[PDB]
Amino acid sequence: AGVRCSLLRLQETLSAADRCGAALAGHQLIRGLGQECVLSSSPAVLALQTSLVFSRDFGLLVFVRKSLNSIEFRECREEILKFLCIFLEKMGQKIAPYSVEIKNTCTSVYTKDRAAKCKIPALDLLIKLLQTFRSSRLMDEFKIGELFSKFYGELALKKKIPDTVLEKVYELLGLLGEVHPSEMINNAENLFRAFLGELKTQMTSAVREPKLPVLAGCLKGLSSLLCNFTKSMEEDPQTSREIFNFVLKAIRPQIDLKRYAVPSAGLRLFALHASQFSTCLLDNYVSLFE
Amino acid sequence: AGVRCSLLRLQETLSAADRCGAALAGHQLIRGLGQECVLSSSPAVLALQTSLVFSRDFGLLVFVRKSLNSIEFRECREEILKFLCIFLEKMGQKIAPYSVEIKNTCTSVYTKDRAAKCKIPALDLLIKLLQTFRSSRLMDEFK
Amino acid sequence: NRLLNFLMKHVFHPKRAVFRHNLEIIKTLVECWKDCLSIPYRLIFEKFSGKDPNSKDNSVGIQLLGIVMANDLPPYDPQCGIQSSEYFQALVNNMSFVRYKEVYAAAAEVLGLILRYVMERKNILEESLCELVAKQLKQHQNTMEDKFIVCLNKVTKSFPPLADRFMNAVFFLLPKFHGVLKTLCLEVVLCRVEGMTELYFQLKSKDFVQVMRHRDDERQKVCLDIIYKMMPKLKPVELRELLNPVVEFVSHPSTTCREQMYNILMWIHDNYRDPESETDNDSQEIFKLAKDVLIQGLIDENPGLQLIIRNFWSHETRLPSNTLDRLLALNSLYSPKIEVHFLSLATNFLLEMTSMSPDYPNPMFEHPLSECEFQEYTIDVLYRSYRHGDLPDIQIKHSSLITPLQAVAQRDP
């Protein structure tokens, strides 16, 4: 029983913090928490970790959702969410039942400026939920209304947020535009209202530099929305070619860094729904194959 | 019983802090503690305050002597010690028995530089002990 | 109006007492001459505006329009403006104080009252108002260190149909502690709204029990008013334990909160449908535990709160009219914790049917053997159960005999 009980005790013991004023007294215990949780790599220990960590009376996520005077808890999120993000798909076969509790767990307050260290994963955890749980009942059911209210308010805020969360807002709005059921067929049209001018604004109109994250977020948001409203009826030469040229414009690397999501949106939509825009091929040549 | 019970409740209720990361989340509760303790000005309420505050299971001084991860607790000392310094001789007839516990209560860690806000009263409380208890058995005995 | 104008330019006085005199004298001025004055808004545009590092650039004159609402004066009789909205947002920008003395804002308690102002009398400005006001209110929480709870707390009880967007995100963010701020957020939750259905999973967490009694008197009443306002739909499995400390708020000091307790209990007994004795339902436990406090609540030292239960038990709710069934019901009303007062309470409940009798105009014999008399005396707490009749004071209505019986019975065992 050594293998199971070792991790069980190493998790049960380190179930309380002592966050106070001292030398790095707000990061080290959480670092140990993460570095001891990572050792879970077998199905048995993975099941035990999913039972313990995703409990409601104890675990990392419970006090993450309960620590709200969280100025020095931003480092705790910085560690735990950035660990669980990789954890949810590195080994995620066991954890079906608690993605709803994970959605309850994510949360947001920060200074408006250049950075705060949890602005990367704050919605990237929900992006991993999008990737992990796809068409399943874990989605299309659980309060997508709260998201399309609050984050639509975030988009109407009109760039009063830094880069890292603005990318995620555009991306997650675009992907939530793909979860069709039960809501917002009428509000889907507003996405173009921005995505028509702002994508031109970001990349080649040098008013603001074509830095990668804003471009990647704007493209990913603009891309995922045409998963529905199929263009076999109308708008193939209107909103499936003059944004498609924008997709080509964005896929090419505006700098040689060429990060993951900057071209990923276009190629992903190409692999998924190239079948929708079809009248364009009547004149469009495929000589760009090389 | 309104006069006594009012101060008794206003002290018993505010017996726990919530020191965390927020806008002035390390000073305001202690400021309220001090500004509600100052209202004690009669011999009965002075006796009640000396019984409650100078207890060992609860009170300001107990957690002052127990808060040692005390970077943001320096403001708590800044308030409580600077209040009790004036408190010990503004009205100090009642408090004979616990000057030894006060001597146990004072304590010291700080950055070496130009200032830290508890470097004024840290030994000035013991100076007030010198002034208050003079030739008495409270001194010449205790360590 | 032009006499008012100079004060409207200069209400400010560094002495606060003369400032109160100024406010009171303008209040009397508008209280006597309300039908001879008008309100030019250009005189008041700058009475709320300004831009300083903390406060009071061109404005300390806030009670100016506070008097308007307090004494029944309609606004916007003179025409509006497209940029009357800055009158809102500039004062909202006054949030950045570092004031040390529990005021938290020169941003007006009164400013949010536009939703109250312009609902009964319809002007369309509020609809464009609210959206942008809320946008900037959610944004500037990260501008500088100060709290926006007051920006809902003082505008509470204003336009309830849209007063709930804040909680929709705040509940994940600022569940409250810290005393006075805790009471402010209690008053914030006091707004009645449908926006929450599944939130009782929050109270499925325990410690809303000792916090109930954190600070004395009126501060904590919203906590019980929570259950009060969500009573209709519940299946109170957890109000079992939640009412257990309420068993001890008889032991915990309060009077207004105890009155709210008694109202809660009075609704409970009637509304789990006590006569609906379903054979299988779990309400049997709460039956007896609710009776456990419903009986003893009469022991409470507030005489008015004793009477509020004395009249309550005397309705057809449990106590019948038939004399021997009445004896048995009160006989059934005994509890081990009321033995000290049971005799007085039993006789009190018994003699009320004598207290209502149409035979009072029939004194015992009424035969006029003597002539007349009357008198009254008072020298200082007193007592009141005397009255004079047609005969000398020898013969009075029967109430004069029964009432002192229970009067003394409440005192001497």
- DSSP calls for A154-220: HHHT-S-S-HHHHHHHHHHHHHHTT--TTS-TTGGGHHHHHHTTHHHHHHTSTTS---HHHHHHHHH
Cα(A64)–Cα(A61) distance, rounded to whole angstroms?
Answer: 5
User: Which pair of tokens denotes residue B60?
Assistant: 């300001």
User: Which pair of tokens denotes residue C376?
Assistant: 């009254």
SS (H, E, C) chain C: CHHHHHHHHCCCCCCHHHHHHHHHHHHHHHHHCCCCCCCCHHHCHHHCCCCCCCCCCCCCCCHHHHHHHHCCCCCCCCCCCCCCCHHHHHHHHHHCCCCCCCCCCCCCCCHHHHHHHHHHCCCCHHHHHHHHHHHHHHHHHHCCCCCCCHHHHCCCCCCHHHCCCCHHHHCCCCCCCCCHHHHHHHHHHCCCCCCCCCCHHHHCCCCCCCHHHCCCHHHHHHHHHHHHHHHHHCCCCCHHHHHHHHHCCCCCCCCHHHHHHHHHHHHHHHHCCCCCCCCCCCCHHHHHHHHHHHCHHHHCCCHHHHHHHHHHHCCCCCCCCCHHHHHHHHHHCCCHHHCCCHHHHHHHHHHHHHHCCCCCCCCCCCCCCCCCCCCCCCCCCCCCCCCCCCCCCCCCCCHHHHHHHHHHHCCCC
Q: Which DSSP letter does residue B21 get? A: B
Which class for A158: exposed (0-12), middle (13-18), buried (19 or more C-beta within 10 A)? exposed
How many other C-beta atoms lie within 10 A of the C-beta of residue C62? 17
User: Does the distance separating the beta carbons of C216 and B9 come in below 8 Å?
Assistant: yes
Domain boundaries, chain A: 5-290
Cα(B116)–Cα(B75) distance, rounded to whole angstroms?
Answer: 10
Superfamily (CATH H level) for A5-290: Leucine-rich Repeat Variant (1.25.10.10)
SS3 A21: strand
Please name the method used to determine this structure. cryo-EM
CB C260 within 8 A of CB C225: yes
Interface test with C, best of A71, A105, A109 (most C CBs within 10 A): A109
C355: Cβ contacts below 8 Å, ≥ 6 apart:
C399, C402, C403
Q: Does C177 touch chain B (CB under 8 A)?
A: yes
Which among A8, A107, A112 is positioned nearest to A50, based on CA atoms? A8
Q: Does C96 touch chain A (CB under 8 A)?
A: no
Interface test with A, best of B71, B74, B78 (most A CBs within 10 A): B71
User: Does the distance separating the beta carbons of B18 and C100 come in below 8 Å?
Assistant: no
Q: At B53, phi and psi to the nearest 5?
A: -60, -40
Q: At B21, phi and psi to the nearest 5?
A: -95, 100
Q: Does A20 touch chain B (CB under 8 A)?
A: yes
Over its C-alpha atoms, chain A yields an Rg (Å, rounded) of: 21
CA distances from C129 to B55, C88, C112, C331 (A): 55, 9, 11, 64
Q: At A70, phi and psi to the nearest 5?
A: -110, 40
User: Which pair of tokens denotes residue C153?
Assistant: 């707390």
Q: Does C42 touch chain B (CB under 8 A)?
A: no
Of B9, B24, B31, the CB nearest to C145: B24
User: Does the distance separating the beta carbons of C214 and B29 come in below 8 Å?
Assistant: no
CB C179 within 8 A of CB B10: no
Q: Write out chain C residues lying below 8 Å of B14, CB-based.
A: 179
Q: Does C147 touch chain B (CB under 8 A)?
A: yes
CB A128 within 8 A of CB A88: yes
Interface test with A, best of C130, C164, C172 (most A CBs within 10 A): C172
Of B14, B18, B23, the CB nearest to C147: B23
To one decimal, the resolution in angstroms is: 5.7
